[PDB]
Amino acid sequence: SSQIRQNYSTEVEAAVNRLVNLYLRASYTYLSLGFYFDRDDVALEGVCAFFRELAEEKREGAERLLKMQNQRGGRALFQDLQKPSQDEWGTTPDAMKAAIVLEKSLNQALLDLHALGSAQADPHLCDFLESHFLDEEVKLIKKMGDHLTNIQRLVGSQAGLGEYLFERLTLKH
Amino acid sequence: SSQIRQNYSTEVEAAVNRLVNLYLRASYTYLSLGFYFDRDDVALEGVCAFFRELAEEKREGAERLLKMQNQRGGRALFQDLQKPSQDEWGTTPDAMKAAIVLEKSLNQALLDLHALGSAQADPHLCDFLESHFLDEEVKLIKKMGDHLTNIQRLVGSQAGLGEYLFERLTLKH
Amino acid sequence: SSQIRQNYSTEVEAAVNRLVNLYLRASYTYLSLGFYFDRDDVALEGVCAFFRELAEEKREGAERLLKMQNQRGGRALFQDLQKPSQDEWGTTPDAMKAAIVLEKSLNQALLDLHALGSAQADPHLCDFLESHFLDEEVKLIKKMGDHLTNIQRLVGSQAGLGEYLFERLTLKH
Amino acid sequence: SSQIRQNYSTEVEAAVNRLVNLYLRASYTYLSLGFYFDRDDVALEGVCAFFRELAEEKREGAERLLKMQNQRGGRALFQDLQKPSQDEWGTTPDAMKAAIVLEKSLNQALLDLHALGSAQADPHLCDFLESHFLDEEVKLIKKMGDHLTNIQRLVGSQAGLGEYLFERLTLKH
Ligand SMILES: [Ru+3]
Ligand SMILES: [Ru+3]
Ligand SMILES: [Ru+3]
Ligand SMILES: [Ru+3]
Please state the domain extents for chain B.
Answer: 1-173
> Which residue, among C115, C87, C89, C113, has the nearest Cα to C101 in the 3D structure?
C89
Of A4, A124, A128, the CB nearest to B145: A4
Choose among D10, D120, D1, D5: nearest CA to D73: D5
**What distance in angstroms lies between residue A103's CA and the mean position of ligand 2's atoms?**
25
Q: Residue A123 C-alpha to ligand 2 middle, in angstroms?
A: 6
In angstroms, how far is CA D9 from the centroid of its own chain? 25
C-alpha A73 – ligand 2 centre gap (Å): 21
Please name which of D51, D40, D156 lies closest in space to residue D98, comparing C-alpha atoms.
D51
Ligand 1 midpoint to CA A126 (Å): 4
- Judged by a CB distance cut-off of 8 A, whether residue B108 touches chain A is yes
Task: Say if the Cβ atoms of C4 and D115 lie within 8 Å.
Answer: no
State the CATH architecture for A1-173. Answer: Up-down Bundle (1.20)
Query: By the 8 A CB rule, do A26 and D135 touch?
Result: no
Quick one: which H or E segment has residue A110?
helix A92-119
Paired with A81 in beta bridges are: C81
The residues in A 72-91 lying below 8 A from D, measured between CB atoms, are: none
CA distance B39 to A169: 69
By C-alpha distance, the chain A residue nearest D141 is A40
Using CA atoms, how far residue C60 sits from A56, C73, C132, D24, in Å, is 12, 20, 11, 38
CA-to-CA dists, residue B6 to B19, B121, C105, C107, D11, angstroms = 21, 12, 66, 68, 95
| Closest CA in chain A for residue D144 | A40
Task: Tell me which method was used to determine the 3D structure.
Answer: X-ray
Cβ <8 Å between A31 and C78: yes
* CB atoms near residue D154 (< 10 Å): 26
CA distance D28 to A11: 72
CA distance D130 to chain C (A): 6
Half-sphere exposure (Cβ direction) of B150: Cα atoms closer than 13 Å:
29
Q: Could you tell me if A110 and A137 are in contact, meaning their C-beta atoms sit under 8 angstroms apart? A: yes
How near does any CA of chain A get to the CA of C28, in Å? 9
**Among the listed residues C48, A56, C130, C52, the one whose alpha carbon sits nearest the alpha carbon of residue D126:** C130
Residues 6+ positions from C149 with CB-CB distance below 8 Å:
none
Residue C149's H or E segment, with its range, is helix C135-155
Q: Are B107 and A10 in contact (CB under 8 A)?
A: no
B138 C-alpha to center of ligand 2: Å? 16
Contacts of residue C170, Cβ cutoff 8 Å, sequence gap at least 6: C46, C147, C150
Distance CA D30, CA D100 (A): 12
> Any known ligand binding at C60?
yes
- C-alpha to C-alpha distance for A35 and C77, rounded to whole angstroms: 10
| Beta carbons of B133 and B68 less than 8 angstroms apart | no
Contact C151, C93 (CB under 8 A): yes
Q: Which candidate from A4, A123, A128 shows the least CB-CB separation from B142?
A: A4
What phi and psi values does residue B105 have, to the nearest 5 degrees? -65, -35
The closest of A53, D6, D64, C135 to C127, measured between CA atoms, is C135
Do residues A164 and D158 touch, judged by C-beta distance below 8 A?
Answer: no
CB B118 within 8 A of CB B126: yes
Q: How many CB pairs (< 8 A) connect C and D?
A: 41
Cβ neighbors of D47 (< 8 A, separation 6 or more) are: D37, D92, D95, D167, D171
Chains C and A touch (3+ CB pairs under 8 A): yes
Span from the CA of C113 to the centroid of ligand 3 (angstroms): 10
* Contact indicator for D50, D172 with CB cutoff of 8 Å: no
Q: How far is CA D54 from the centre of its chain?
A: 7
Could you say which of A45, A163, A169 has the minimum Cβ distance to residue D153?
A: A163
Please indicate whether, in this complex, the C-beta atoms of B165 and C161 are within 8 angstroms of each other.
Answer: yes
The whole-angstrom separation of Cα A3 and Cα B100 is: 9
Interface of D with A in 121-150 (CB under 8 A): 142, 145-147, 149-150
Q: CB–CB of C42 and B149 under 8 A?
A: yes
Q: What is the resolution of this structure in A?
A: 1.9
Calculate the CA dihedral of residues A109, A111, A112, A118 and round it to 10 degrees.
140
Residue D146: count of CB within 10 angstroms of its CB: 22
Q: With an 8 Å Cβ cutoff, are C32 and A84 in contact?
A: no
Distance in Å from the first CA to the final CA of chain B: 49
Q: How many CB atoms lie within 10 A of CB C84?
A: 19
Distance B108 CA to ligand 1 centre (A): 18
Q: What are phi and psi of A165, to 5 degrees?
A: -70, -40
The DSSP H or E segment spanning B95 is: helix B92-119
What beta strand segments (E) does chain B contain? Answer: none
Q: Is residue C6 less than 8 Å (CB to CB) from chain D? A: yes
A3 DSSP 8-state letter = S
- Residues 41-70 of chain C with CB under 8 A from chain A are 41, 63, 66-67, 69-70
Contact D130 C121 (CB under 8 A): no
Phi and psi for B156 in degrees, rounded to 5? -55, -60
Q: Coil, strand, or helix at residue A81?
A: strand
Chain A residues close to C67, C-beta within 8 Å: 35, 38
* Spatial distance between the Cα atoms of C93 and C162, rounded to a whole number of angstroms: 11
d(CA B172, CA B170): 6
Alpha-carbon distance of B77 to B73, in angstroms, equals 13
- For A141, other C-beta atoms within 10 Å of its C-beta total 16
* Nearest ligand for residue B119 CA: 2
Work out the number of other CB atoms within 10 angstroms of the CB of residue C47: 28
> What one-character-per-residue DSSP string does chain D give?
--S---S--HHHHHHHHHHHHHHHHHHHHHHHHHHHHTSTTT--HHHHHHHHHHHHHHHHHHHHHHHHHHHTT--------PPPS-S---SHHHHHHHHHHHHHHHHHHHHHHHHHHHHTT-HHHHHHHIIIIIHHHHHHHHHHHHHHHHHHHHHSS-HHHHHHHHIIIII--
For CA atoms D22, D23, D24, D26, the dihedral sign is positive
CA dihedral B23, B24, B25, B31 (to 10 degrees): 110
**Helix, strand, or coil (residue C81):** strand
Is there a binding annotation on residue C53?
yes
